[PDB]
PDB file of C-alpha atoms in Angstrom:
ATOM      1  CA  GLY A1347    -175.449 146.866 -37.075  1.00  8.47           C
ATOM      2  CA  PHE A1348    -174.062 149.461 -34.981  1.00  9.83           C
ATOM      3  CA  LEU A1349    -175.573 153.342 -35.109  1.00 10.56           C
ATOM      4  CA  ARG A1350    -172.703 155.806 -35.767  1.00 12.74           C
ATOM      5  CA  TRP A1351    -171.173 158.526 -32.582  1.00 15.86           C
ATOM      6  CA  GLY A1352    -171.209 161.418 -35.417  1.00 15.37           C
ATOM      7  CA  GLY A1353    -174.146 161.169 -36.330  1.00 17.43           C
ATOM      8  CA  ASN A1354    -177.658 158.391 -36.256  1.00 16.63           C
ATOM      9  CA  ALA A1355    -181.172 159.503 -36.950  1.00 15.31           C
ATOM     10  CA  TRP A1356    -182.747 157.911 -33.388  1.00 15.49           C
ATOM     11  CA  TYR A1357    -184.572 160.168 -31.058  1.00 18.63           C
ATOM     12  CA  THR A1358    -181.950 160.234 -28.150  1.00 22.85           C
ATOM     13  CA  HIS A1359    -178.975 160.048 -30.688  1.00 24.26           C
ATOM     14  CA  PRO A1360    -177.092 157.749 -28.402  1.00 21.28           C
ATOM     15  CA  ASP A1361    -172.675 158.335 -28.815  1.00 21.82           C
ATOM     16  CA  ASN A1362    -172.060 155.560 -27.587  1.00 20.13           C
ATOM     17  CA  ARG A1363    -171.738 152.804 -30.415  1.00 21.90           C
ATOM     18  CA  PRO A1364    -174.524 150.078 -29.239  1.00 27.01           C
ATOM     19  CA  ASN A1365    -175.321 147.688 -31.165  1.00 27.63           C
ATOM     20  CA  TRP A1366    -178.605 147.978 -32.686  1.00 27.78           C
ATOM     21  CA  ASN A1367    -181.375 146.119 -34.897  1.00 29.51           C
ATOM     22  CA  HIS A1368    -184.655 147.646 -35.702  1.00 29.48           C
ATOM     23  CA  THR A1369    -187.720 146.056 -38.403  1.00 31.61           C
ATOM     24  CA  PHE A1370    -189.530 147.926 -40.667  1.00 31.61           C
ATOM     25  CA  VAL A1371    -193.014 146.325 -42.343  1.00 30.69           C
ATOM     26  CA  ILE A1372    -192.021 147.126 -46.118  1.00 30.83           C
ATOM     27  CA  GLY A1373    -196.119 146.713 -47.146  1.00 30.49           C
ATOM     28  CA  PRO A1374    -199.376 146.735 -45.032  1.00 32.10           C
ATOM     29  CA  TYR A1375    -199.064 149.104 -42.730  1.00 34.39           C
ATOM     30  CA  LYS A1376    -198.639 146.873 -38.882  1.00 37.30           C
ATOM     31  CA  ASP A1377    -197.793 149.704 -36.875  1.00 40.00           C
ATOM     32  CA  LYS A1378    -196.162 152.796 -35.644  1.00 38.71           C
ATOM     33  CA  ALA A1379    -192.465 151.803 -35.264  1.00 38.00           C
ATOM     34  CA  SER A1380    -192.523 149.158 -38.251  1.00 40.09           C
ATOM     35  CA  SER A1381    -194.056 151.381 -41.113  1.00 39.32           C
ATOM     36  CA  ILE A1382    -191.407 154.370 -42.241  1.00 36.35           C
ATOM     37  CA  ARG A1383    -194.844 156.147 -43.744  1.00 36.01           C
ATOM     38  CA  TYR A1384    -196.439 156.394 -40.789  1.00 36.16           C
ATOM     39  CA  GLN A1385    -193.056 158.493 -39.380  1.00 36.18           C
ATOM     40  CA  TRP A1386    -192.230 160.584 -42.311  1.00 36.42           C
ATOM     41  CA  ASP A1387    -195.599 161.851 -42.689  1.00 32.78           C
ATOM     42  CA  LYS A1388    -195.911 162.554 -38.821  1.00 34.80           C
ATOM     43  CA  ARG A1389    -192.528 164.219 -38.728  1.00 32.42           C
ATOM     44  CA  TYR A1390    -194.089 167.568 -38.252  1.00 33.11           C
ATOM     45  CA  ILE A1391    -195.226 165.900 -34.394  1.00 36.21           C
ATOM     46  CA  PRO A1392    -192.382 166.029 -32.137  1.00 34.77           C
ATOM     47  CA  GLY A1393    -194.287 164.394 -29.936  1.00 34.80           C
ATOM     48  CA  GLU A1394    -194.981 161.257 -32.745  1.00 34.41           C
ATOM     49  CA  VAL A1395    -191.241 160.759 -33.277  1.00 35.57           C
ATOM     50  CA  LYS A1396    -190.517 157.639 -30.570  1.00 37.56           C
ATOM     51  CA  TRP A1397    -188.018 155.739 -33.000  1.00 38.62           C
ATOM     52  CA  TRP A1398    -186.364 157.856 -36.369  1.00 38.83           C
ATOM     53  CA  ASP A1399    -185.803 161.229 -36.478  1.00 39.33           C
TER      54      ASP A1399
ATOM     55  CA  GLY B1181    -183.366 163.817 -12.548  1.00 40.15           C
ATOM     56  CA  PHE B1182    -182.253 164.940 -16.012  1.00 39.31           C
ATOM     57  CA  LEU B1183    -178.577 163.369 -16.649  1.00 37.41           C
ATOM     58  CA  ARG B1184    -176.918 166.571 -17.901  1.00 43.06           C
ATOM     59  CA  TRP B1185    -175.710 166.647 -21.205  1.00 42.44           C
ATOM     60  CA  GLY B1186    -171.536 167.952 -20.927  1.00 42.83           C
ATOM     61  CA  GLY B1187    -170.948 164.537 -18.325  1.00 42.40           C
ATOM     62  CA  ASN B1188    -172.350 161.898 -16.757  1.00 43.25           C
ATOM     63  CA  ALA B1189    -171.462 159.031 -14.949  1.00 43.07           C
ATOM     64  CA  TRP B1190    -173.558 156.296 -16.754  1.00 41.99           C
ATOM     65  CA  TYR B1191    -171.692 153.362 -18.299  1.00 40.84           C
ATOM     66  CA  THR B1192    -173.598 154.619 -21.994  1.00 39.80           C
ATOM     67  CA  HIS B1193    -173.003 157.957 -20.996  1.00 41.45           C
ATOM     68  CA  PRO B1194    -176.086 159.155 -22.836  1.00 37.28           C
ATOM     69  CA  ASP B1195    -176.250 163.177 -23.986  1.00 36.49           C
ATOM     70  CA  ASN B1196    -179.381 163.556 -24.692  1.00 38.58           C
ATOM     71  CA  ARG B1197    -180.771 165.025 -21.621  1.00 39.18           C
ATOM     72  CA  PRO B1198    -182.794 161.275 -19.938  1.00 36.25           C
ATOM     73  CA  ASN B1199    -185.295 161.813 -16.843  1.00 33.28           C
ATOM     74  CA  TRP B1200    -183.294 159.358 -14.972  1.00 36.19           C
ATOM     75  CA  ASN B1201    -184.269 157.011 -11.903  1.00 33.96           C
ATOM     76  CA  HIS B1202    -181.282 155.046  -9.631  1.00 35.13           C
ATOM     77  CA  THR B1203    -181.939 153.385  -6.494  1.00 32.86           C
ATOM     78  CA  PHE B1204    -179.221 152.696  -4.385  1.00 30.40           C
ATOM     79  CA  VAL B1205    -179.394 150.284  -0.891  1.00 25.75           C
ATOM     80  CA  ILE B1206    -177.878 151.821   1.968  1.00 26.18           C
ATOM     81  CA  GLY B1207    -177.401 148.998   3.686  1.00 24.66           C
ATOM     82  CA  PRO B1208    -175.950 145.195   3.215  1.00 25.12           C
ATOM     83  CA  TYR B1209    -175.279 144.834   0.095  1.00 24.41           C
ATOM     84  CA  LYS B1210    -178.963 143.342  -1.725  1.00 24.86           C
ATOM     85  CA  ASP B1211    -177.771 143.309  -6.088  1.00 25.11           C
ATOM     86  CA  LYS B1212    -174.919 144.873  -8.621  1.00 24.10           C
ATOM     87  CA  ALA B1213    -177.100 147.322  -9.568  1.00 26.42           C
ATOM     88  CA  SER B1214    -178.236 148.768  -5.798  1.00 25.30           C
ATOM     89  CA  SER B1215    -174.692 148.345  -4.029  1.00 26.94           C
ATOM     90  CA  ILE B1216    -172.022 151.075  -4.735  1.00 29.12           C
ATOM     91  CA  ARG B1217    -169.356 149.655  -2.350  1.00 31.06           C
ATOM     92  CA  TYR B1218    -169.533 146.084  -5.191  1.00 30.88           C
ATOM     93  CA  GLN B1219    -169.281 147.893  -8.314  1.00 30.73           C
ATOM     94  CA  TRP B1220    -166.708 150.521  -7.114  1.00 31.30           C
ATOM     95  CA  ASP B1221    -164.920 147.354  -5.786  1.00 29.18           C
ATOM     96  CA  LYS B1222    -164.909 145.210  -9.809  1.00 29.62           C
ATOM     97  CA  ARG B1223    -164.783 148.831 -11.404  1.00 29.46           C
ATOM     98  CA  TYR B1224    -161.165 146.658 -12.189  1.00 27.94           C
ATOM     99  CA  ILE B1225    -163.351 144.772 -14.872  1.00 28.74           C
ATOM    100  CA  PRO B1226    -164.682 146.572 -17.409  1.00 27.02           C
ATOM    101  CA  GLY B1227    -167.448 143.485 -17.959  1.00 24.58           C
ATOM    102  CA  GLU B1228    -168.848 143.926 -14.974  1.00 26.16           C
ATOM    103  CA  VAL B1229    -169.121 148.058 -15.644  1.00 26.46           C
ATOM    104  CA  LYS B1230    -173.292 147.740 -16.406  1.00 25.18           C
ATOM    105  CA  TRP B1231    -174.775 150.985 -14.618  1.00 24.57           C
ATOM    106  CA  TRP B1232    -172.496 153.443 -13.123  1.00 23.81           C
ATOM    107  CA  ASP B1233    -168.878 154.061 -14.244  1.00 26.36           C
TER     108      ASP B1233
END
């Protein structure tokens, strides 16, 4: 879907309402991009914030 | 360099001050992305506006 102009959680905070697709893996960890738990836990490291804020 | 938050001419109008590199070809046409004249002339076609507004 398209991210809202007012505010979205993507780290670049786009404001052009872009079409966007992202896959999470509900289950065991496989990679950082698709792991909600990894991103959530490492939210205290700005350098690891590459997908969702 | 990094595009200004207030306003830039990239068609997505980013507001995260991203580092940005773009090459123009000063001389004969080679491709649409690097041709100022092509982009300028075709500015009446929204679908051809893929690099600079």
